[PDB]
Amino acid sequence: SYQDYINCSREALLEKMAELLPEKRLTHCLGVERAAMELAQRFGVDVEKASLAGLLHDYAKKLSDQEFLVLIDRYQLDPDLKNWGNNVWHGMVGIYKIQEDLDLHDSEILRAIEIHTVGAGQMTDLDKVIYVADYIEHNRAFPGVDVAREIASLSLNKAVAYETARTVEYLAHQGFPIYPQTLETYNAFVHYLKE
Amino acid sequence: SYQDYINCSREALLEKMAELLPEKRLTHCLGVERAAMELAQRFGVDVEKASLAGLLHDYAKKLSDQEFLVLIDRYQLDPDLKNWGNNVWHGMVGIYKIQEDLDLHDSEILRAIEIHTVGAGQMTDLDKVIYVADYIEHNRAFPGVDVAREIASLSLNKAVAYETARTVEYLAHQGFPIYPQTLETYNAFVHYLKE
Numbered sequence A, B: 001s002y003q004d005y006i007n008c009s010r011e012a013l014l015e016k017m018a019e020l021l022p023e024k025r026l027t028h029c030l031g032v033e034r035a036a037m038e039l040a041q042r043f044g045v046d047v048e049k050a051s052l053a054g055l056l057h058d059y060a061k062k063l064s065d066q067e068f069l070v071l072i073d074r075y076q077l078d079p080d081l082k083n084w085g086n087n088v089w090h091g092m093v094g095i096y097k098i099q100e101d102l103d104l105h106d107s108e109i110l111r112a113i114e115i116h117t118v119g120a121g122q123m124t125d126l127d128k129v130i131y132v133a134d135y136i137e138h139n140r141a142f143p144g145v146d147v148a149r150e151i152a153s154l155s156l157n158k159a160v161a162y163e164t165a166r167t168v169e170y171l172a173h174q175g176f177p178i179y180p181q182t183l184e185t186y187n188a189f190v191h192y193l194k195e
């Protein structure tokens, strides 16, 4: 059960999240919970750790900038983090709010949430499952989500590769700054697109 | 005259380059020489340093992988350079071959050639002129070269921004590794696209 990792039941958690997140965002988290379970079954990852990390991954999506800045100071995180914003913060810094609220201390689950947006050069299979689940969950409708879904049915690594390449491409298309850890993921995984 | 910086005349240099480079590549270098002069006039850069750096920028385009690897060892350059290829090497490492052949020691000209492909987070106006001249020279015909030309008529910084964003975008589109210094340039300049 989820209470093996956090300080409340799944139902209690959903009630809490429903007050923290807009409906669309909670529906997304439920989609990621389901997609993570499916991916974990396929690729040999603990389904429960995957489901819980999937449900929790966007728990901190709505924290204020000021809240994130307070957390960076309090936990003495990389000071360069203050040069970024919610996109980087909600996973990389938001894990500390999840930990405070829910008594989440499992290192694997925390790491998977931490890097769910940007990835890393080295990712555990759990990390990859969350990173991909987030992108392919049933409620997502962006062009090429179908390609991502097909790839994810066959290869976890290639699915990470596809997502990271499409993300870097779109960030540059839009003219948005690219977090250096995002590039680390990109350069580590892009070769799988030849797979 | 060019002999103020190198060990031969412009005519002698062209004769040498014609044996080192395919016709198309030498024509490109001549295009960059001209474009660099125009940009330097517009943006307050020494026209002669610009023209010479423009002509020379792709001098090392055709060196073998083995030649580049020898230069990396000989000059004890960043050992990470061995993980890359001609795209990174021809400017970043090729400057040493230019220096050996032509007795080029001018630090400003060398730096502008060095970073002409990838840029840097901090670029001199000469660096920017070469970086942009390369992209917009008259022989270039790629989609959106017209946009780059228009921007370059107005703002050197915005032209760097446009080129770097389009390059990162295309590298991710194609699935090619992105050199970390390229990202440094991208993150430093992308804000100018709001200009």
Ligand SMILES: Nc1nc2c(ncn2[C@@H]2O[C@H](COP(=O)(O)OP(=O)(O)O)[C@@H](O)[C@H]2O)c(=O)[nH]1
Binding pocket: A028, A058, A061, A087, A088, A116, A117, A118, A134, A167, A171, A176, A177, A178, A179, A180, A182
């Ligand atoms: N500026 C910036 N945004 C990024 C980067 N990587 C991902 N993002 C964006 O962060 C946003 C949230 O991403 P993610 O956490 O994966 O999905 P979500 O929380 O379900 O929307 C998206 O718009 C991504 O494109 C980056 O390196 N830089």
Ligand SMILES: Nc1nc2c(ncn2[C@@H]2O[C@H](COP(=O)(O)OP(=O)(O)O)[C@@H](O)[C@H]2O)c(=O)[nH]1
Binding pocket: B028, B058, B061, B087, B088, B116, B117, B118, B134, B167, B171, B176, B177, B178, B179, B180, B182
């Ligand atoms: N793999 C890779 N290629 C790059 C990077 N930056 C630029 N290039 C490519 O290097 C090639 C040569 O670039 P450049 O020196 O600017 O132009 P050229 O020498 O006149 O063709 C082009 O195909 C660029 O897209 C990078 O970060 N990684």
Ligand SMILES: [Fe+3]
Binding pocket: A057, A058, A090, A091, A116, A117
């Ligand atoms: Fe997220």
Ligand SMILES: [Fe+3]
Binding pocket: A028, A032, A057, A058, A134
């Ligand atoms: Fe999400």
Ligand SMILES: [Fe+3]
Binding pocket: B057, B058, B090, B091, B116, B117
């Ligand atoms: Fe070049």
Ligand SMILES: [Fe+3]
Binding pocket: B028, B032, B057, B058, B134
């Ligand atoms: Fe060139």
Ligand SMILES: [Mg+2]
Binding pocket: A086, A087, A088, A089, A090, A091, A092, A114, A116, A117, A118
């Ligand atoms: Mg994040």
Ligand SMILES: [Mg+2]
Binding pocket: A088, A091, A092, A113, A114, A115, A116, A117, A118, A119
């Ligand atoms: Mg993250």
Ligand SMILES: [Mg+2]
Binding pocket: B086, B087, B088, B089, B090, B091, B092, B114, B116, B117, B118
């Ligand atoms: Mg180069």
Ligand SMILES: [Mg+2]
Binding pocket: B088, B091, B092, B113, B114, B115, B116, B117, B118, B119
């Ligand atoms: Mg270069």
